[PDB]
Amino acid sequence: LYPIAVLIDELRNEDVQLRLNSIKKLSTIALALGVERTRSELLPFLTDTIYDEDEVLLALAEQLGTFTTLVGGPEYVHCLLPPLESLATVEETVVRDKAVESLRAISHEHSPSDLEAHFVPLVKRLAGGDWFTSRTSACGLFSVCYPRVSSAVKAELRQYFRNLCSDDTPMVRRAAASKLGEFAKVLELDNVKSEIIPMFSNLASDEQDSVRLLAVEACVNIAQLLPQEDLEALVMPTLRQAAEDKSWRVRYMVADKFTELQKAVGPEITKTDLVPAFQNLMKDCEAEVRAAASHKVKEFCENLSADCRENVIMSQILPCIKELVSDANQHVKSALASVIMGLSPILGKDNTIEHLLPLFLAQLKDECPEVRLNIISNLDCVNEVIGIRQLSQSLLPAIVELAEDAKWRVRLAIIEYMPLLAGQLGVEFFDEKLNSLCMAWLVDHVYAIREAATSNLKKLVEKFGKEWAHATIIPKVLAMSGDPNYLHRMTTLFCINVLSEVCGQDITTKHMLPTVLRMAGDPVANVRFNVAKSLQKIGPILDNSTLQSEVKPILEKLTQDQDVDVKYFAQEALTVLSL
Amino acid sequence: GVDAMYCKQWPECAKKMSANCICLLCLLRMKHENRKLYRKDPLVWVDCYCFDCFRMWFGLDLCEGTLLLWCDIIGQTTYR
Ligand SMILES: [Zn+2]
Ligand SMILES: [Zn+2]
């Protein structure tokens, strides 16, 4: 040809790193050779040749992906079948992984006659091969052809797909199982009943737990292809067995895909079969399962039968739960604590109060933060269910104790809820034993916490009015500008920085603007490099009048402080306000 | 438990990290490699007792869980 003695030197190439840059661009070479030349000696070369390193092969098989056209089109695509059937048999999976990817791809680019002609034959070649690899690499080629061949070919494929599900090598059986999924979708009921199912069963009960496992995965999709009528007769016996399975890994499968199955099965089979099962999962020996179960709690209940719901939950689920709250595994606890608050708009005020608060409360006190954390996050809700007053005579307490929780997150958590909380409780109530709480945070060991606490005020004001700010907050804040610890005085200038945003002109100017300007003479330069930044912040709020009267004046003197930082900022202010 | 006989230093040996080791895991792999020169066919848990052939036969991931199992089997086998 032309590069048939040029690419060869490019290949035999002393180094390997360039044979990548060669095959990677093995499409501008097919462009070169005509569609009669690409398949003339270009494909017959890449066949009985190329033995390079696995990565080169990866390159080749990938490239042989986009090619259906660079050799003709749906008329000739079946000229790519022999160079793959070779790659799809190498031992390193990463490679044959791709190859089968390409195979599957260009399969569509075939013609009904093309398939029963060359493809399907290769599918029997791989599947019959000596090397388990090949048969494995085969498994992923049935789902594609079958849909478009003869009722005689189908008769073979299926038959073939069966010997695989029983292969001597688990590798392959796992393969077939990991493929029982889709291949069942392209079959037509009659089959799926008298074939998939049997395979699905055998596989769900195969010696290797690593396969029954892969079987169960298939369950949902299968069950999603049979009207309710049959499921009780086909899927259930198996699915039933699953939940009990010797291998936790399998029970886990069932557990984890539990909701999905619900919606797959039906609403009645759910209480007839699943619900009992769910109970044993939650009671399961292996935590990794109990946990995987606990997550499913809420959604499971929600999607129960519109009617029996309240019943089953209270009679079946609810008791297990109450046992889970005391679980040993920091996880199961944790998992559950996340979804448990979800059983209220589902159960009921009273019920919740009698049956759930103790639970929540048990959790609000857990020694684990991921838990304490998980419970705090859904409170905003339950308050909808049980009365607001009920909330204060049961949880309010825990919540307060929570606000002095050891862990900053937990604290943080309480803080972000507080605004919403107060709101609900009423200003007058807050004023009592909540205010004090919100102010302490302004001094938390951890910055993130203090910062949040500060915002909290702003939020709190927005919810309660500047009047409120004025006689309840502003004070304690300015008073805090007295504390000997220089850090705290800063916190003070910060609150001012925040409150000013929502207290309006007339209040900033007569209760804060002052204290701000005063601290501008703090023995600690830091307080002062910040006092500038502040006068800058609460600048636009003020009026051109008050500004040039007290701001600019006792702001200028600042550009004449020692510490450069002070200066750095002091004037930066004047650079925005126009001074 | 896990003798420095079956496997010395976990994470490593399992992936040729420990040098000139003398644990079965390490050694058995060598048999595997060696044994795979004269032969072209892919080795399989029956014919090989190497940690990897094992894993693949039961499709288990690389973790101490799987290391323990492999040992129980190499044990039952070394003892009649
Ligand atoms: Zn070793
Ligand atoms: Zn081996």
From Swiss-Prot, chain A:
Changing residue 461 to A: In HJS2; uncertain significance; does not affect interaction with PPP2R5D and PPP2CA. One of its GO terms (biological process) is mitotic sister chromatid separation. Residues 1-390 are annotated as: PP2A subunit B binding. It is found in: Cytoplasm; Nucleus; Chromosome; Chromosome, Centromere. InterPro entries: ARM-like (IPR011989), ARM-type_fold (IPR016024), HEAT (IPR000357), HEAT_type_2 (IPR021133), PP2A/SF3B1-like_HEAT (IPR054573), PP2A_Regulatory_Subunit_A (IPR051023). Its main location: cytoplasm. Signal peptide: none annotated. Keywords: Acetylation, Cell membrane, Cell projection, Centromere, Chromosome, Chromosome partition, Cytoplasm, Disease variant, Host-virus interaction, Intellectual disability, Membrane, Nucleus, Repeat. Changing residue 171 to T: In HJS2; likely pathogenic; disrupts interaction with PPP2R5D and impairs interaction with PPP2CA. Residues 76-230 are annotated as: SV40 small T antigen binding. It comes from the Eukaryota. Pfam families: HEAT (PF02985), HEAT_2 (PF13646), PPP2R1A-like_HEAT (PF22646). One of its GO terms (molecular function) is protein antigen binding. Changing residue 489 to L: In HJS2; likely pathogenic; disrupts interaction with PPP2R5D and PPP2CA. Residues 38-312 are annotated as: Polyoma small and medium T antigens Binding. Residues 391-579 are annotated as: PP2A subunit C binding. The modification N6-acetyllysine is found at residue 271. The PR65 subunit of protein phosphatase 2A serves as a scaffolding molecule to coordinate the assembly of the catalytic subunit and a variable regulatory B subunit. Upon interaction with GNA12 promotes dephosphorylation of microtubule associated protein TAU/MAPT. Required for proper chromosome segregation and for centromeric localization of SGO1 in mitosis. Together with RACK1 adapter, mediates dephosphorylation of AKT1 at 'Ser-473', preventing AKT1 activation and AKT-mTOR signaling pathway. Dephosphorylation of AKT1 is essential for regulatory T-cells (Treg) homeostasis and stability. Belongs to the phosphatase 2A regulatory subunit A family. This is Serine/threonine-protein phosphatase 2A 65 kDa regulatory subunit A alpha isoform. It comes from Homo sapiens (Human). The lineage of its organism: Eukaryota, Metazoa, Chordata, Craniata, Vertebrata.
Curated annotation (Swiss-Prot), chain B:
Interacts with host PPP2R1A; the interaction inhibits PP2A activity. It is found in: Host cytoplasm; Host nucleus. It comes from Simian virus 40. The lineage of its organism: Viruses, Monodnaviria, Shotokuvirae, Cossaviricota, Papovaviricetes. This is Small t antigen. A zinc finger (H1C3-type) spans 32-53. The chain holds residues 91 to 170 of 174 of the full protein. Promotes efficient viral genome replication by accelerating both G1 and S phase progression of the cell cycle. Inhibits host PP2A by binding to the A subunit, thereby displacing lower affinity regulatory B subunit. Inactivation of PP2A in turn results in the transactivation of cyclin A and cyclin D1 promoters. Late during the infection cycle, ST may induce dephosphorylation of host eIF4E-binding protein EIF4EBP1 leading to the inhibition of cap-dependent translation. May establish and maintain high levels of viral genomes during persistent infection in cell culture. The common region of SV40 ST, 17kT and LT proteins comprises the J domain. This domain is essential for multiple viral activities, including virion assembly, viral DNA replication, transformation and transcriptional activation. This domain is also required for cyclin A-transactivating activity of ST. A zinc finger (C4-type) spans 13-26.
